[PDB]
From Swiss-Prot, chain A:
Tissues and organs where the protein is expressed, per its UniProt entry: Neurons, certain endocrine cell types and spermatocytes.
Miscellaneous: Antibodies against AMPH are detected in patients with stiff-man syndrome, a rare disease of the central nervous system characterized by progressive rigidity of the body musculature with superimposed painful spasms.
Provenance organism: Homo sapiens
Subcellular location: Cytoplasmic vesicle, Secretory vesicle, Synaptic vesicle membrane; Cytoplasm, Cytoskeleton
Signal peptide feature range: none
Protein name per UniProt: Amphiphysin
Superkingdom field: Eukaryota
Function per UniProt: May participate in mechanisms of regulated exocytosis in synapses and certain endocrine cell types. May control the properties of the membrane associated cytoskeleton.
Subunit structure: Heterodimer with BIN1. Binds SH3GLB1. Interacts with REPS1 and SGIP1. Binds AP2A2. Interacts with AP2B1. Interacts with DNM1 and SYNJ1.
UniProtKB/Swiss-Prot annotation, chain B:
Stated role: Component of the adaptor protein complex 2 (AP-2). Adaptor protein complexes function in protein transport via transport vesicles in different membrane traffic pathways. Adaptor protein complexes are vesicle coat components and appear to be involved in cargo selection and vesicle formation. AP-2 is involved in clathrin-dependent endocytosis in which cargo proteins are incorporated into vesicles surrounded by clathrin (clathrin-coated vesicles, CCVs) which are destined for fusion with the early endosome.
Entry's localization field: Cell membrane; Membrane, Coated pit
Parent-protein residues present: 701 to 938 of 938
Tissues of expression: Expressed in the brain (at protein level).
Species lineage: Eukaryota, Metazoa, Chordata, Craniata, Vertebrata
Source organism, top-level taxon: Eukaryota
Record note on what altering E216A does: Strongly reduces AMPH, SNAP91 and BIN1 binding. Slightly reduces EPS15 and auxilin binding
Record text on subunit structure and interactions: Adaptor protein complex 2 (AP-2) is a heterotetramer composed of two large adaptins (alpha-type subunit AP2A1 or AP2A2 and beta-type subunit AP2B1), a medium adaptin (mu-type subunit AP2M1) and a small adaptin (sigma-type subunit AP2S1). Binds EPN1, EPS15, AMPH, SNAP91 and BIN1. Interacts with clathrin. Interacts with HIP1. Interacts with DGKD. Interacts with DENND1A, DENND1B and DENND1C. Interacts with FCHO1 and DAB2. Interacts with ATAT1; this interaction is required for efficient alpha-tubulin acetylation by ATAT1. Interacts with KIAA1107.
Name of the molecule in the record: AP-2 complex subunit alpha-2
UniProt record similarity statement: Belongs to the adaptor complexes large subunit family.
Effect in UniProt of substituting F146A: Reduces SNAP91, AMPH and BIN1 binding. Abolishes AMPH and SNAP91 binding. Abolishes EPN1 and EPS15 binding
Native source organism of the sequence: Mus musculus
Length: 9, 247
């Protein structure tokens, strides 16, 4: 899938 | 939001009725107010149970619903009078019919007045009628979801809140919280199985708001990042605040 970014680094 | 300890205030248990409809909303040493509710489309029906905990009758028992100037144009409440006499140990029921006109943030005020032992008893408590109650969950495949996710144009329609968890980050509890909140819980949308994705429609008389959401737990930090994207800025704002307080 693909959200632009992710909170959990 | 007010300054000072929230104990014996008008919203001691308000937060507990955001993701569930039933429970005891308020209880002092004379009276217990219980709640049972159901919502469909932009409507709902709330049952309010008034339990007399004493050995004597309450007289001139008068419950009134009060909606602030703006709230009133956004929320419509209708109900019938309750018999002003409640025996000791007895419970009397009041039905409140609800109609959501447009999105809102404020909560209605329930004012109860009655005579006990010849004294004036006066109680006020906020009624847990929140925007997410008018949710229509919408299941959809991952592809559909992302297609809709990227149709946001208005940057104001995207509200993100990064907050500290006020409760243990239990997975099953979290699931139940999101489902109870109202949107559908979509599986396998976020590749990371620890995250939660939600989608649903907020129903109101004048407009139907599409809403998407993403909850991201960070167990080590004990934090979350909640992301809301809806077709209306104020809806994205209010749902983000409401849901943020639940974790």
């Amino acid at each position: 899938s693909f959200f632009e970014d992710n909170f959990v680094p | 939001g007010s300054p000072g300890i929230r104990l014996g205030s008008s919203e001691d248990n308000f937060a507990r009725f955001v993701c569930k409809n039933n429970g005891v909303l308020f209880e002092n040493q004379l009276l217990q107010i219980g709640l049972k509710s159901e919502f469909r489309q932009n409507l709902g029906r709330m049952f309010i149970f008034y339990g007399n905990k004493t050995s004597t009758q309450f007289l001139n028992f008068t419950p009134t619903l009060i909606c602030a100037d703006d709230l009133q144009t956004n929320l419509n409440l209708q109900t019938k009078p309750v018999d002003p006499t409640v025996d000791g140990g007895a419970q009397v029921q009041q039905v409140v019919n609800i109609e959501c006109i447009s999105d809102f943030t404020e909560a209605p005020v329930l004012n109860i007045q009655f005579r006990y032992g010849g004294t004036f008893q006066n109680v006020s408590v906020k009624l847990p009628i929140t925007l997410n109650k008018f949710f229509q969950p919408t299941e959809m495949a991952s592809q559909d979801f992302f297609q809709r996710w990227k149709q946001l144009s208005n940057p104001q329609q995207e509200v993100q809140n990064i907050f500290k968890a006020k409760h243990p980050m239990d997975t099953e509890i979290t699931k139940a919280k999101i489902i109870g909140f109202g949107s559908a819980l979509l599986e396998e949308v976020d590749p990371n199985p620890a995250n939660f994705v939600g989608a649903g429609i907020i129903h109101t008389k004048t407009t139907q708001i599409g809403c998407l959401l993403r909850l991201e737990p960070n167990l080590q930090a004990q934090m979350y990042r909640l992301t809301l994207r809806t077709s209306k800025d104020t809806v994205s704002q209010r749902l983000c605040e409401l849901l943020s307080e639940q974790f």
